[PDB]
Amino acid sequence: LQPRRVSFRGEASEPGYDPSRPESFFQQSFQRLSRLGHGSYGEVFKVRSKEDGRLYAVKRSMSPFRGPKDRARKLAEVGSHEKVGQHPCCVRLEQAWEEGGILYLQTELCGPSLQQHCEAWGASLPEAQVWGYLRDTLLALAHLHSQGLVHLDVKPANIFLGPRGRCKLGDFGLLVELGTAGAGEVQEGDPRYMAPELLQGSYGTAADVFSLGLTILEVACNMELPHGGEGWQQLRQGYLPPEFTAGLSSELRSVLVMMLEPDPKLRATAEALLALPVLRQ
Ligand SMILES: Cc1cc2c(C(N)=O)c(N)n(-c3c(C)ccc(O)c3C)c2nc1C
Numbered sequence: 001l002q003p004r005r006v007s008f009r010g011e012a013s014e015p016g017y018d019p020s021r022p023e024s025f026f027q028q029s030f031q032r033l034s035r036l037g038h039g040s041y042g043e044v045f046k047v048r049s050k051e052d053g054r055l056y057a058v059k060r061s062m063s064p065f066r067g068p069k070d071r072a073r074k075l076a077e078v079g080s081h082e083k084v085g086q087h088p089c090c091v092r093l094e095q096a097w098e099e100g101g102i103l104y105l106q107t108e109l110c111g112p113s114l115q116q117h118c119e120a121w122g123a124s125l126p127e128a129q130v131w132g133y134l135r136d137t138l139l140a141l142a143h144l145h146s147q148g149l150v151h152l153d154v155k156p157a158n159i160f161l162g163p164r165g166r167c168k169l170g171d172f173g174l175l176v177e178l179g180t181a182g183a184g185e186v187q188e189g190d191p192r193y194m195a196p197e198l199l200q201g202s203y204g205t206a207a208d209v210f211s212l213g214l215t216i217l218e219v220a221c222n223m224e225l226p227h228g229g230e231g232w233q234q235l236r237q238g239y240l241p242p243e244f245t246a247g248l249s250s251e252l253r254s255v256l257v258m259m260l261e262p263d264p265k266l267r268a269t270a271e272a273l274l275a276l277p278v279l280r281q
Contacts, residue, residue: 002025003026003098003104004098004099006096007082008079015051016029016051025097026058026060026099026104030048033045042060042062044059045057046109047106057110059105060102060104060105076173080175084172087140087143088168089167091168091169094108107170110160111160111161112161114156114160124221124222125219127248130216130219130252133165135274138212144169145269148178150203150204151169151174152187152189154169156218158170158171174186195207195211196210196236202264209267209270209273210264220252237262238257240257
């Protein structure tokens with residue numbers, strides 16, 4: 001068994017590793033410092049590299065490829081991540097590879113997720129912090145949207161905090177590229193964060209703007225989003241719930257109304273919000 005590089009630039013398979021030894025390439029070229037997370041996808045470890053001594057994160061699938069479709073779905077994440085490319089507010093992928101039917105993604109190391117930060121804070125985030133995260137996530141989304149890419153999974157768990165109040169959008173596994181001249185396939189998203197038009201099958205960049213709006217609403221007001229039912233509909237009528245949003249400033253409330261616009265024809269784009277006075281810093 002040997003590891004093979006995974007990339008969608010056409011490269012077939014673009015030191016310190018001995019194929020003869022039984023230990024896998026992941027074990028030979030890294031030291032596992034800690035386990036950042038785990039779930040149905042597999043595991044994420046913090047690691048240090050031996051080629052350049054920098055710190056990285058590695059995500060690995062749980063169990064070997066069931067079939068060609070299972071392999072193709074998992075590898076597509078590498079392809080979607082490459083379409084994003086290098087941008088300051090997007091998690092950067094170093095390299096990805098497969099060995100033993102296991103997929104590995106190596107990225108830069110980032111801090112805790114917005115979700116973890118909010119759980120530890122145990123309350124609504126201070127508004128000043130919220131503006132920074134909103135601005136950086138809008139910049140990430142403006143980058144994706146300018147290339148015809150929709151993230152489809154914007155939420156606190158997929159936003160990663162950095163030093164000095166900055167953050168990065170990550171997890172491009174559900175990313176799709178818009179194209180009536182090309183092709184595409186869509187996976188199931190988190191219903192709590194779903195834009196209303198997705199129910200009727202209309203996909204576009206505006207869905208991400210709605211998801212970010214629900215994301216900011218959740219962390220700025222410490223509010224649990226509903227999966228369905230009347231509460232789910234109440235958030236998609238264009239009216240904010242008065243009880244939770246009371247403490248919010250006029251500027252943030254007004255930005256939230258624009259992002260939560262039910263009609264995707266009328267919803268603000270990321271480029272447009274970033275040109276508003278508060279966000280144009
Ligand atoms: C729990 C967790 C932490 C990190 C992480 C980090 N603390 O730095 C990182 N970079 N990812 C990551 C990885 C490893 C691959 C592709 C990708 O989009 C992302 C956002 C992480 N994922 C998870 C699930």
